[PDB]
Amino acid sequence: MEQLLADYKKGNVILFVGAGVSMNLGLPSWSQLVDHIATELGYDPDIYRTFGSALELAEYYKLKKGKIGPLRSWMDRMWHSSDIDINKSKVHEYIAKANFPIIYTTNYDRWIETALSNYGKEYIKISSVSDIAKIDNNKTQIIKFHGDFDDDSSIVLDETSYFQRLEFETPLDIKFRSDVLGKSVLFIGYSLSDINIRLLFYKLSKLWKEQKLEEAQPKSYIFLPRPNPIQEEILEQWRIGMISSENDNPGESLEEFLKNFVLV
Amino acid sequence: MEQLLADYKKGNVILFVGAGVSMNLGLPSWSQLVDHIATELGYDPDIYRTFGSALELAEYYKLKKGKIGPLRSWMDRMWHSSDIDINKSKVHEYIAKANFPIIYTTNYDRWIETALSNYGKEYIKISSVSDIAKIDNNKTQIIKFHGDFDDDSSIVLDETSYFQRLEFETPLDIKFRSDVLGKSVLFIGYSLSDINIRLLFYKLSKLWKEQKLEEAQPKSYIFLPRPNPIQEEILEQWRIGMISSENDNPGESLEEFLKNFVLV
Amino acid sequence: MEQLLADYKKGNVILFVGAGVSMNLGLPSWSQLVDHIATELGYDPDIYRTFGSALELAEYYKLKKGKIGPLRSWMDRMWHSSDIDINKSKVHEYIAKANFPIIYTTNYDRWIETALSNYGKEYIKISSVSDIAKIDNNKTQIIKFHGDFDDDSSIVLDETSYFQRLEFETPLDIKFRSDVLGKSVLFIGYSLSDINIRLLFYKLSKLWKEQKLEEAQPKSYIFLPRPNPIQEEILEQWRIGMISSENDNPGESLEEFLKNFVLV
Amino acid sequence: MEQLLADYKKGNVILFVGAGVSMNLGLPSWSQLVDHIATELGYDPDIYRTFGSALELAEYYKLKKGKIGPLRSWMDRMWHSSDIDINKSKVHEYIAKANFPIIYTTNYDRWIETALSNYGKEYIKISSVSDIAKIDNNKTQIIKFHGDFDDDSSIVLDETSYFQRLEFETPLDIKFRSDVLGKSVLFIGYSLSDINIRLLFYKLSKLWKEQKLEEAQPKSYIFLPRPNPIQEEILEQWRIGMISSENDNPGESLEEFLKNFVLV
């Protein structure tokens, strides 16, 4: 913790956002997305989810409708509905009020950008390789590392798109390596049942292991509300410490963790 | 499937073996291996199960013991016990009597070698680059793709050497690429239900997948005991049509599927 | 003899173990191992032992298979077969119930560890240099001085590895000199025709002759059930007193010898 | 063997002497010397062989008589008797006519010196560091590697002197290391079938093969009349090939092997 605040005072921390930050807004979950595509395919939305681990169901929806078009239209409609209030979430307020230079995300929504616009912070949203030219160092860089609703070719929403992201050769990953070469990277709102984040940590450990800079770039951190001891011990071997909260309810625990950065 | 049989007369087919073949023999499963790990480390057999799925549990046991030595010894003693006979295995008999030129496996035990020794068909077991020079074209070759108990360096049981194997730099991967050039593959006994597994395929898929020039690398196939349209559409994307039986028990489903290959 | 029991009451004794205590449990002999490697190399199990002597034959098996992997697999399989009972051997019961702080062994099996756990005695198994950090004084330190099946590199099974261990610069050997330096050493179950025991004796006697502590180091002891006058005379100049029994059958002779330590 | 004769033209070959050279002349071997020690100490000639091999016997005679005085005097009297003629040994004639620059011998007799004196080739006898000052390239060198009968302190015939000679600190070992760098060695009459022997062989084996690369690191050879797979596959790591004859008697096999060196 204290070493993380020492790196944050130097500005060498890069923030990741997952869906766990987005849980506080009352956004639609992936289960109701499965319900919507099951009703669109005329399936009962339990017998549809026997034979699919969500993203395989989105693969079937893409291969049935021909594209991710109606699917992206539906998530852009209900992910930014009018009843969603950004001022009731303390996590987004503490994200926007903190002095984070680069904020990466794998979310598909725009509520981090909406939270930054709400609290009077200028930002540059980066989604593809063309937007890297618009980087201003007085503004917060938002990289939609998993794509955004403004481009269907850059959306990861299916097994195949997840798999060429797991190949890790798109130029956003080249920019990502270029930002995390000197700094530490903080991960909030993720779960370790996810495979792509663990393979991302492993790819970082392999990349820093081939080119000889073991002594450079201090260890990354991931925040968890549940203290997992042996997951901490296995993540230590890749040079990633875990940070465990004390409170059990994850919304106020995550808000109490993000409270440590706004005062600076 | 008839075109698969027509290619199978030509001998242009490769056999893969998963855990579904090993289910018939009465071998100790992965769950009781996790229970043995937990009782060795002092945990309860199901408290320790709520700590990650399989590979991270195996790597936590490895890091608390320094190496995978005791666990390899325990799996060699339990998976080659004297109370298991290959003569009662109809599935291994059906594999052994078939004229498969090259057989691959992701299982660590040598029960396919035990079946080929019992049923008289001579084989050459490949586990490293040393056995590549001892190849002989008139004898079948069993390639342990995930290693075997004769070498602790090439055992794929922990997440670290697994994620080492995911980029496909070992000479077994180049040997598999050269063997799959212009030929088809049978995957039997796999449950495309655990990301990892899937991933593999993808990668592996690529091999033949991207390929199209001449040949066609036909298009391999996978057997499943359960007919299913979603994985039919996704696996119909990569390059793999499944064949499904009309039965419930997987052992006799494998027997009646392999009986099409036995009699010719 | 009374000096040895006086040293045992002070806890200055370090016990060794050869194959002689392992003969009582119906363990396979080496000759049976010679038969197995003759069958695996296709030799009849007499012609293969005309032109070699045990360690060589294991060298040739290691060379033909490229490693000691299949050798260690068969060793581990038939050395821990489930029909072998540990409670029926009174030798291991007298080993486990006796208050021995540090126990060395050259056996590759786990039967001393299984006998120590079978009678409710905690222990710490040491096989490599990393295990020395887990030493507890309240647990007996089972030390696999010749290695065990949990590591292929630590196993001495071949003539070249026998010469590595006969050189005596391993870190386990440095640890061994550190335990021996104040204490007497009791050897049981060893044959006097072995080379490494005599050259270990000579290395110990020379090393105490270079560092001037002849007055320190009460003399070691070896238990041979067959009396031998001239072998006692050569071992007397290396400060090892030979101890001989009366009954000629070695099993109850060794049990009556180890009876003197269980009651204390 | 062709490479052996090619390097023999280059003069980079050294020769060792074992008991196979001595068996042609009809010297009293180790068996009747054991019988003489046994009837000297009051035992039966074959009752000692249940107590030790040879070195334990020689050390027991040394410890009983106080020194090796009577044993060296008896061995010098029986190994230089008047009924032994050096002209009848064709093997001794063949090593006399060969142009070997350096000769090493582990035999304690002086029959190599007697053969060189009989056939007129002038030599230099080395037994200690006092003889190393009298070197003279020109002549040929004979080095009693295990001592002779002029010096009782350097003769290596008991277990303790042999155990002093494994670790190679005498100046003969430094002279031997300087001779072997850049050159190859021969071995004849060396059963390689008695641990000890094997041992030295190995220890020695090191030095050269020990030496890494560069220069020539010439190999080395041992002549055995019996062909054998296990020991060539074990001696080939040590950079020692062997040459096998097709004949049963070792005397004429030795004679026809050393006939190849007198004509060059």
Side-chain angles (χ1 to χ4, degrees), chain A residues 6-28:
Chain A
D7 266 342
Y8 171 63
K9 251 82 153 178
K10 294 179 179 180
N12 305 9
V13 291
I14 307 170
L15 195 161
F16 257 63
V17 187
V21 190
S22 148
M23 179 247 335
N24 312 273
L25 274 295
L27 293 204

Side-chain angles (χ1 to χ4, degrees), chain B residues 76 110 149-150, chain C residues 30 32-34 36-38 40 48 54-63 65-79 149 152 155-158:
Chain B
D76 198 14
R110 317 186 209 85
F149 293 150
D150 305 336
Chain C
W30 254 65
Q32 177 151 9
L33 168 76
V34 161
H36 165 255
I37 62 183
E40 285 298 319
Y48 201 28
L55 266 300
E56 311 219 281
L57 272 41
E59 259 285 343
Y60 195 76
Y61 188 76
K62 139 88 160 53
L63 277 174
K65 298 312 200 37
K67 47 205 166 186
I68 46 184
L71 200 32
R72 188 226 62 247
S73 283
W74 192 88
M75 274 285 297
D76 191 27
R77 272 195 303 275
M78 341 291 307
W79 248 250
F149 301 138
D152 281 326
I155 276 294
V156 54
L157 222 48
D158 62 79

Side-chain angles (χ1 to χ4, degrees), chain C residues 43 48 50-53 56-57 59-60 63-64 159-160 163-164 166-167 192 195 198-199 202-203 206 226-231 233-234 237-238, chain D residues 43 48 50-52 56-57 59-60 63-64 159-160 163-164 166-167 192 195 198-199 202-203 206 210 226 228-231 233-234 236-238:
Chain C
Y43 289 78
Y48 201 28
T50 87
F51 45 79
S53 62
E56 311 219 281
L57 272 41
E59 259 285 343
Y60 195 76
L63 277 174
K64 279 307 146 304
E159 186 79 276
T160 44
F163 289 163
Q164 310 318 336
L166 253 204
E167 274 197 357
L192 276 174
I195 166 69
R198 318 179 77 82
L199 173 154
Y202 181 72
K203 280 282 151 44
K206 184 207 300 302
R226 167 182 195 265
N228 207 322
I230 89 177
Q231 284 286 85
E233 170 62 27
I234 167 65
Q237 84 183 1
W238 292 337
Chain D
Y43 289 82
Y48 254 89
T50 86
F51 286 168
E56 295 95 359
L57 275 90
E59 194 95 41
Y60 181 64
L63 287 185
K64 203 53 71 152
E159 186 82 89
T160 298
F163 285 168
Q164 204 283 359
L166 294 315
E167 40 275 37
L192 203 22
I195 166 65
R198 323 168 116 131
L199 217 316
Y202 177 66
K203 195 74 41 181
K206 298 332 274 77
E210 194 133 77
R226 154 181 190 114
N228 220 313
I230 312 299
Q231 307 73 333
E233 199 64 36
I234 284 169
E236 73 103 10
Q237 313 67 345
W238 304 338

